[PDB]
Ligand binder design. Structure first.
Ligand SMILES: CC(C)=CCC/C(C)=C/CC/C(C)=C(\F)COP(=O)(O)OP(=O)(O)O
Ligand SMILES: [Mg+2]
Ligand SMILES: [Mg+2]
Ligand SMILES: [Mg+2]
Length: 324
């Protein structure tokens, strides 16, 4: 394994054991897991474990919603490992059918992976402000559009020539922002909307995004070499800077450290940011909950899970999830 500077406390929901025990019931009822071998491959992903560390403040049905999001997100992502992920028109055809759930009811003929997302989104929005739902829906659309962009890069044989071009694409496909959004829903709070848009909070969220994708590109480095993948930060640094493999990995460790140090600086600015936006007492507490239960958790929880998950330790078996 490889070590990273993550000076944040590890946390896990106290209801994790029940959530992990019951995690299969929902994707089974939605037709997303259709065999016992698929169920065991799901269990080996550790997706309830991941959700319990993203959402340690959540228990019960709130934590279950977090588990189902992790379950759905990785099932969805596995539909693009084969030829579909090499074809933007076929990628967009699936993402369009899923994203349609944001706009209204799905037709009964929608593929199972789309009905599963619609069930998550319905539970995500109920009880939040309408403006929160609209903003979170926009985050989902950025995520789905990102899959189309990635399929374009593969189809036209245009690999990313620089770290900046990769991040501009990978910051959306990494799915961190929809994960952070659910921490708010799972915690039954909303960070003040004018502070979510602030330059300081945007920089904190960008660090959370960047750290997650750097962690993921290292944890999945072996798999993606064995498939000749070129849009991986390790590979892209070797092309952009002409460096070896051991240098690019050390560069990514230092970047994680530098961004975590900057993240701490930005946290110390939040009291003055609240003053600038004239937050009252309640809004200040909501901002503090966002900092500790949403942004900090998505950084730290990802670090613990990328080391233990079975995804980083039968192709086409999930194809029927994307068939109308
Ligand atoms: C845990 C994180 C980062 C986010 C929370 C769950 C969500 C919404 C994940 C989005 C999908 C994702 C990051 C991958 F599939 C990993 O990237 P990639 O497909 O390149 O590598 P693999 O994980 O498939 O090997
Ligand atoms: Mg994948
Ligand atoms: Mg993928
Ligand atoms: Mg990866």
């Amino acid at each position: 394994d490889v070590d990273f500077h993550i000076p944040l406390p590890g946390r896990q929901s106290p209801d994790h054991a029940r959530a992990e025990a019951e995690q299969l019931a929902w994707p089974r009822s939605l037709g997303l897991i259709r065999s016992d071998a698929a169920a065991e491959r799901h269990l080996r992903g550790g997706y309830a474990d991941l959700a319990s560390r993203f959402y340690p403040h959540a228990t019960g049905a709130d934590l279950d919603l977090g588990v189902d999001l992790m379950s759905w997100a990785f099932l969805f992502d596995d539909l693009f490992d084969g030829p579909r992920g090499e074809n933007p028109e076929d990628t967009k055809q699936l993402t369009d059918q899923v994203a349609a759930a944001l706009d209204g009811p799905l037709p009964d003929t929608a593929p199972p992976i789309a009905h599963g997302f619609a069930d998550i989104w319905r539970r995500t929005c109920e009880g939040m402000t309408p403006a929160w739902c609209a903003r979170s829906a926009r985050h989902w659309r950025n995520y789905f559009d990102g899959y189309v962009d990635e399929a374009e890069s593969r189809f036209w044989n245009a690999p990313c020539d620089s770290a900046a071009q990769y991040l501009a694409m990978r910051r959306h496909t990494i799915g961190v922002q929809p994960t952070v959004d659910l921490a708010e829903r799972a915690g039954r709070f909303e960070v003040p909307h004018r502070v979510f848009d602030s330059a300081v909070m945007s920089a904190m969220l960008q660090i959370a995004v960047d750290v997650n994708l750097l962690l993921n590109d290292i944890a999945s480095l072996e798999k993606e070499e064995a498939r000749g993948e070129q849009n991986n930060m390790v590979m892209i640094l070797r092309r952009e800077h002409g460096w070896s493999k051991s240098r690019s990995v050390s560069h990514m460790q230092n970047e994680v450290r530098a961004r975590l140090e900057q993240y701490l600086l930005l946290e110390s600015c939040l009291p003055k940011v609240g003053e600038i936006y004239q937050l009252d007492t309640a809004e200040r507490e909501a901002l503090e909950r966002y900092r500790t239960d949403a942004v900090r958790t998505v950084i730290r929880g990802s670090y613990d899970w990328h080391r233990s998950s079975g995804r980083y330790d039968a192709q086409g078996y999930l194809e029927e999830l994307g068939s109308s």
